Write a protein that binds this ligand. Structure first.
Ligand SMILES: [Zn+2]
Ligand SMILES: [Zn+2]
Lengths: 136, 322, 141
RNA sequence: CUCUUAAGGUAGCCAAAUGCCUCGUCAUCUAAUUAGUGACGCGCAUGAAUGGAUUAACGAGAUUCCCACUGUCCCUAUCUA
RNA sequence: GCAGUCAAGCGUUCAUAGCGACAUUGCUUUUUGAUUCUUCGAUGUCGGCUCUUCCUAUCAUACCGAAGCAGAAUUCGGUAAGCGUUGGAUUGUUCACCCACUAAUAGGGAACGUGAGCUGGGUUUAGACCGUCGUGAGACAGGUUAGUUUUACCCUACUGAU
């Protein structure tokens, strides 16, 4: 988790596995992100890994600004549609799985984030919180 | 500047070893200038100069024994196909010389272009002649009618099919690749003369090396990887209606009005109107693949279906008019 | 109107840029992870050469596929957007080969910078194991 | 000039359902492709009614890719006869 | 394939901190070769899915020792097999190569584990096409395509129940 992540995050329901295509929410010119693998993942036979809110993944771009795509890059999710649970008991879910491009240290690539962002990612990555207007 | 080396003193001696070495050294020291002019300009610019000892030795079998050499050039951009110092070179043995260059496949250029362009060669008092080979001023375009003979040319500018208007007997191999005809062939016809061609070559055209226009037949279009330069150049030419005319595609309403593309879009907004209209999509996600659709428009730009011509020696806005 | 933020004195443009050109030239490097000498192998009877595990490419000296084998040689050159891999001449008898490479490694944040660096490829003589054993006489087919 | 008694692969096409070497070489598709497509061709051993090449349409024909779609899968659960 | 003794000599001068001659003894059946000993009146023959257990010649983890081991990072080494040792592209594939995560992506066995457990892509019938051979029927361990996978209600074992 500590690929530049500040603290330790509680567990969140694994929404979007590999093969998933989530929107991009930054102004980097990318319009979607195809997840291929995950950081901090565990290894079990025939279990394909998965990514939850706040997690860092390896991603590819499938639409936008062809100087970006046909290469792997790190990304950070900021929204998912799978309902998880905060320790205050409430469940919640967005309407779209969405992420952000970043460098391996946690710094973003773009300058601002369209749409809302999870508290569970903003508290963990400060640069994300800096470039975000709406936190839930 | 310097292009072709000399053919020094065959001289009728002996020592096959010597006749080899005095040309092998010539090659080794011919290429020196290429390297001298390699770092001469910046440290990136570098045109397609072959370094093959075998073909550079074969060229020393043909021109002198021909003693009357003639050039072939595509009629779409005839400056780079021409050799600067070939005129300078074929003046060394003090005998019959003067290659007296010619141009070929002149059945694409219009009436009020061809005369003002013949003024180019005539104003510089040099020799030339137009020749439609597939099918001083008192001419238009002369027919098929008008001692050994050389026949040199750039790769696949039509040299391997020019002879199909002379004898029409299909004597030499030809396709649309820049590396077909090899192992020079002395084609016999009209026994009072003997005709010899050569394998193809590529000479030191320093003007326009990186940002140029040698995506005609010089590099293999069937094997390219840049796909934006070689495609974006066609975008700067061929106004937007003509690609809408032939293919029938809908490109763009000039969305990005800032300094991104503006008018005359680049090689990212029209190639995606072709492959998305041809269904050529990638492996993994529906995305209009550019580099394998740029090879279905570039084999149409060079064969002669999509036409653009050179402008006068000065910078001129719009010489062609479709 | 910014400062070079490494040395300080260079007031640069706001086209979108970083510390001073001298500061990125001297301190920052984006070509690490490669040896600048590369030892290849070559025969002295059939003039053949290969990658360490693979078939011998058969290419003659100064061929286009020299660049193919030379990029297939395991470096981090493939990682970063290769371009302008033209050949530099070297002496045939001094048995060395030279190429200049240029990769566009990203600077700090979306600032693309050229890079001009050089590598030398040296060759050692082998006798071609497949070419030999064959001259040796074991069981026939 | 020729050698075998005759002629000596023409137009065309190709790692093709024909290509051993072979996962041929180059480019492209992919994050990655022994696959697929395009091109090259001294082609183990292509080839002209033992028919060659191209072909719109058709095909419970073989093969590759994409959009949509989904318990095929992650990863199993529940209901009925 | 692995190990041990001699170790020319390479390893900033500093024969083993480490790598490597000449050889030499010798191990395992987890490799080919060789035998034809068991099966020719049925031992169902490739791989993969699944699942369990064992071995150690330890990839990681734990504890130690030595290093041209300051730290950091590595290498070598000793006990040690308790626990774990992946997701994917191409390929029928075992093998291989590549991408990516990971503490790690170690090697092997159980009738080359496992078809009344599955599948049937491959091989291995008959149909049919090409190339080469052959006068011809026909051959090719060469390529391609299509092509029926059976039975448990018995004994034991095992799981659970009287
Ligand atoms: Zn500075
Ligand atoms: Zn050899």
């Amino acid at each position: 988790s500590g690929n530049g992540a500040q603290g330790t995050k509680f567990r969140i329901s694994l929404g979007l596995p590999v093969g998933a295509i989530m929107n991009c929410a930054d102004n980097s010119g990318a319009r979607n992100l195809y997840i291929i693998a995950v950081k901090g993942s565990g290894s079990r036979l025939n279990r394909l890994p998965a990514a939850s809110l706040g997690d860092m993944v390896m991603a590819t771009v499938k639409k936008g600004k062809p100087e970006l795509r046909k290469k792997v890059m790190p990304a950070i999710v900021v929204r998912q549609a799978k309902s998880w649970r905060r320790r205050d008991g409430v469940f919640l879910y967005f309407e779209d799985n969405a992420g952000v491009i970043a460098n391996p240290k946690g710094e973003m690539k773009g300058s601002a984030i369209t749409g809302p962002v999870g508290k569970e990612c903003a508290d963990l990555w400060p640069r994300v919180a800096s470039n975000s207007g709406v936190v839930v | 500047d310097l292009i072709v080396p000399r053919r020094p003193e065959w001289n009728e001696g002996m020592s096959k070893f010597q006749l080899d070495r005095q040309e092998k050294e010539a090659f080794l020291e011919w290429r020196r200038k290429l390297a001298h002019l390699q770092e001469s300009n910046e440290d990136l610019l570098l045109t397609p100069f072959e370094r093959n000892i075998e073909v550079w030795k074969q060229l020393w079998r043909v021109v002198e024994r021909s003693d009357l050499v003639v050039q072939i050039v595509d009629a779409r951009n005839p400056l780079l196909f021409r050799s600067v110092d070939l005129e300078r070179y074929v003046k060394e043995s003090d005998d019959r010389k003067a290659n007296l260059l010619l141009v070929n496949k002149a059945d694409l250029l219009t009436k009020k272009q061809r005369i003002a362009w013949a003024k180019y060669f005539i104003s510089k008092n040099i020799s030339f002649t137009f020749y439609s080979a597939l099918r001083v001023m008192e001419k238009v375009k002369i027919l098929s009618i008008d001692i050994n003979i050389g026949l040199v040319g750039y790769p696949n500018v039509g040299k391997s099919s020019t002879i199909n208007s002379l004898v029409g007997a299909k004597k030499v191999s030809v396709s649309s690749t820049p590396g077909k005809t090899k192992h020079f062939q002395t084609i016999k016809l009209s026994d009072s003369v003997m005709l010899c061609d050569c394998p193809g070559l590529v000479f030191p055209n320093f003007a326009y090396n990186k940002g140029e226009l040698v995506c005609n037949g010089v590099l293999p279009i069937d094997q390219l990887r840049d796909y934006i330069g070689p495609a974006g150049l066609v975008a700067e030419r061929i106004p937007k209606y003509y690609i809408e005319a032939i293919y029938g595609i809908h490109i763009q309403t000039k969305s990005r009005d800032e300094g991104g593309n503006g008018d005359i879009p680049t090689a990212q907004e029209l190639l995606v109107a072709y492959a998305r209209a041809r269904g050529y999509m990638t492996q993994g996600y529906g995305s209009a693949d550019e580099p394998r659709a740029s090879r279905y428009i570039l084999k149409d730009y060079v064969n002669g279906k999509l036409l653009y011509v050179n402008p006068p020696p000065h910078l001129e806005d719009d010489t062609p008019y479709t | 109107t910014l400062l070079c933020c490494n040395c300080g004195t260079p007031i640069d443009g706001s086209t979108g840029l970083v510390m001073c050109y001298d500061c990125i030239k001297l301190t920052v490097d984006i070509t690490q992870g490669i040896p600048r000498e590369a030892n290849i192998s070559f025969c002295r009877n059939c003039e053949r050469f290969l990658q360490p595990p693979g078939q011998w490419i058969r290419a003659e000296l100064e061929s286009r596929e020299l660049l193919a084998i030379c990029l297939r040689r395991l470096k981090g050159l493939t990682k970063v957007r290769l371009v302008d891999a033209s050949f530099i001449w070297t002496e045939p008898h001094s048995r060395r080969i030279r190429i200049k490479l240029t990769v566009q490694g990203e600077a700090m944040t979306n600032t693309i910078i050229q890079q001009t660096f050089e590598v030398e490829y040296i060759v050692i003589a082998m006798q071609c194991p497949d070419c030999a054993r064959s001259y040796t006489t074991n069981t026939w087919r």
